[PDB]
Design a protein around this ligand. Structure first.
Ligand SMILES: [Rb+]
Ligand SMILES: [Rb+]
Lengths: 435, 435
């Protein structure tokens, strides 16, 4: 599993419990040196969170190669290593632990290198990082998930499948959402070895597959001299192909994103018969087809009405709505340097859908993508008003998943902290709404 | 096989031959979309290097899932994909190809996303990047290698073993040097599965194991109340342990980095008996033990003298010198962000060992780490006078390996371009000395 660039890992920063009582907190630390080394060459790690934690270098305990040691023990041990491929697991004794949130964590790590003169030893590594503790808030009655979409650009450059699931598991989330043509290697023909490993990974990290995103690419052959549009039979043969893939990998929902014909994203006219021809298979496989309502499409709009009209006309219970919470965005996505007003579509400033608009549709809202862009060290989201959305969603009786779709700056590793902040934010709000 | 963050990869930028004549050049491109896509949704890639190439998007050829297509074929095909996990391989027809060096590649890649309104399509990505062509120059008489030490910090965060080896093979290097306690997982007990895959990888990428870095950590238990010192028998057991590991993994050299007791970096007193107690096993395994001359130790120093004195008092052919080319640094490493003029270590400004001093040691020089810090887009190395170093090495008769050891700023991915520039510069210089 790959390690984060920052020596202080975001993943694993959590309170530690024994028989129900919280005994302290841990975090993980990637070895800074160019090699793993003998554990006895460690000279400790001072830890500080201002106002909550302040301990000298010999106090934290070290879990290395499956066992926990004091520093005094590390000094006298033989054969124990801090292997380069493992983050060191640092436990800090703190009864009751740490409160939910983002915490500015400062470490002073000391390592003895025998090939360096004593007048420059030990080697000392000082770093600080705002890190998000795994959420203590329950978050009832919502179910908590993460889409691998949240890790776009990270995935495949700094992140692999096992690393992302480990990041999702640590958040206390239970649901993983994926994009079929993104995260299924050799799509649409994943190897038997890949699939076996997929279910092993779900078992290991306690995750269940939720939504698998898929496409109906109507413009498949729109270019060149022999251009053509996509037939109904081709649309459904593709949708059916992704329903079976989904079932095979254990997903309950499939979101086909359909090619559009207009500014506010009216799907291609083949969309209706493509879905209708696909509903028998989705019922047979027990998979729900849920198209996505995303900005600039609001809840009150002819495309939602037609989706709901399909539900009435067919009678089906394997067709539903997937909401993207960017329809609720009430503050603008920032301008980048060099851009100026009017150079971008209106909806990027937010279409401010009234969260209550979910009341009249909620019965058909089967899945929710918790889209967001930026959440700071104080758990302040800069675009999505989470309290009213959640209030409305709760009062309306929604009890399904909220699946993180981070879509902020794709700076390397940024998405890991961001997803963590969203889960800490949302679960805390859900708990205060219960009161 | 992770991909580099820049959309234009450095690995795979090379001239392309068929029956000896260069037909053009290729580069590799990471899919920027959040998914892999059917190949017919590609609308082409424009390519430019000022003064060398300027082609429109319908001209480059595309290799995808094992086969090469024109754009017009991609538009008409079915079932071919640009998988998210595969960089696209872009071929630009150009008889004679490109000269050696860094080139400023600008691409204009277009993609058709059906779910986005026509007035905002095709989706377009313009990036420019300085990428170093895989060396055309011979580089004889030296042999060319890379130490995974060059990829420190990237290794384990953005890079794994196979990705590293792919990058070394593409450079046309043949030798891979590793650090045992860095890159052997579960050191010192790699699994039979990892060892088998190691040998699979080397065969696949045409690489040969050269040097395994190793340590004798005399300060193993220097801290705590029960502090002690490393005995000869423990030191020799640690060396003999790395000798066996290196043999099992197929290396021919082991560089023990012995803990020091002073600022001229005089090894710990036990070093002589540790080595003498280890020469039979290195002889029985046919592995050479070569300690490393690193700055601030010059060639003209008791440390080097005692090394050569050991060779002669023992008669061994399994003890040698490893030279680190930083001892030849004639210009200063720049002041790190925020540092103080003078507070840094002294030798980091370079100790300027005369390149001719290799004539007196060359008969016992078995391996050379090509330490460098920074080489810019015109192949200007800012620290290491390569031409006199390389000319001295050639006139002294050295025909061994020059193993890259990038030690510049550890910006994510920067080591990749840096090593490629290193091999391009040196192979080109070497070729001029052949005249
Ligand atoms: Rb979405
Ligand atoms: Rb070195």
């Amino acid at each position: 599993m790959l390690l984060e660039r920052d020596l202080i890992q975001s993943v694993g920063f959590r309170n530690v419990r024994e028989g129900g009582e919280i005994t302290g907190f841990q975090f993980r630390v990637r070895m800074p040196s160019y090699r793993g080394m003998a554990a006895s060459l460690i000279d400790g790690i001072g830890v500080r969170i201002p106002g909550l934690v302040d301990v000298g270098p010999d106090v934290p305990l070290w879990t290395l190669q499956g066992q926990q040691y004091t520093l005094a023990e590390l000094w006298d041990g033989d054969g124990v290593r801090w292997p380069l491929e493992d983050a060191a697991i640092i436990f800090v004794p703190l009864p009751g632990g740490l409160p939910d949130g983002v915490h500015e964590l400062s470490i002073e790590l000391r390592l003895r290198m025998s090939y360096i003169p004593q007048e420059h030893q030990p080697s000392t590594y000082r770093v600080t990082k705002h890190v998000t503790l795994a959420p203590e808030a329950s978050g009832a009655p919502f179910r908590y998930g993460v889409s691998l979409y949240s890790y776009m650009s990270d995935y495949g450059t700094v992140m692999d499948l096992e690393t992302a699931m480990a990041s999702i598991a640590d958040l206390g989330a239970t649901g993983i959402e994926i994009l079929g043509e993104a995260h299924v290697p050799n799509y649409p023909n994943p190897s038997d070895e890949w699939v076996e490993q997929w279910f092993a990974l779900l078992s290991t990290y306690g995750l269940e597959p939720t939504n698998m995103g898929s496409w109906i690419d109507t413009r498949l052959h729109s270019s060149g001299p022999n251009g053509r549009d996509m037939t109904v039979e081709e649309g459904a043969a593709a949708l059916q192909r992704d329903l079976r893939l989904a079932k095979r990998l254990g997903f309950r929902f499939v979101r086909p994103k359909i090619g559009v014909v207009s500014s506010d994203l009216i799907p291609h006219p083949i969309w209706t018969e493509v879905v209708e021809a696909s509903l028998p298979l989705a019922e047979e496989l027990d998979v729900i087809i849920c198209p996505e309502i995303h900005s600039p499409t609001p809840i009150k709009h002819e495309v939602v009405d037609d989706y709901i009209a399909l539900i009435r006309r067919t009678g089906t219970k394997h067709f539903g709505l997937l909401l993207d919470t960017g329809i609720f965005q009430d503050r603008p996505i920032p301008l980048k340097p060099g851009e100026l007003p009017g150079q971008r579509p209106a909806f990027l400033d937010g279409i401010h859908v009234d969260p209550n608009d979910v009341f009249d549709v909620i019965e058909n809202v089967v899945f929710i993508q918790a889209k967001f862009h930026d959440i700071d060290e104080e758990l302040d989201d800069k675009q999505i008003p989470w309290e009213p959305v959640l209030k409305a969603l709760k009062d309306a009786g929604y009890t399904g998943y909220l699946s993180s779709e981070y879509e902020g700056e794709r700076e390397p590793w940024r998405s890991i902290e961001q997803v963590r902040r969203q889960h800490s934010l949302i679960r805390q709000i859900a708990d205060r709404l219960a009161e």
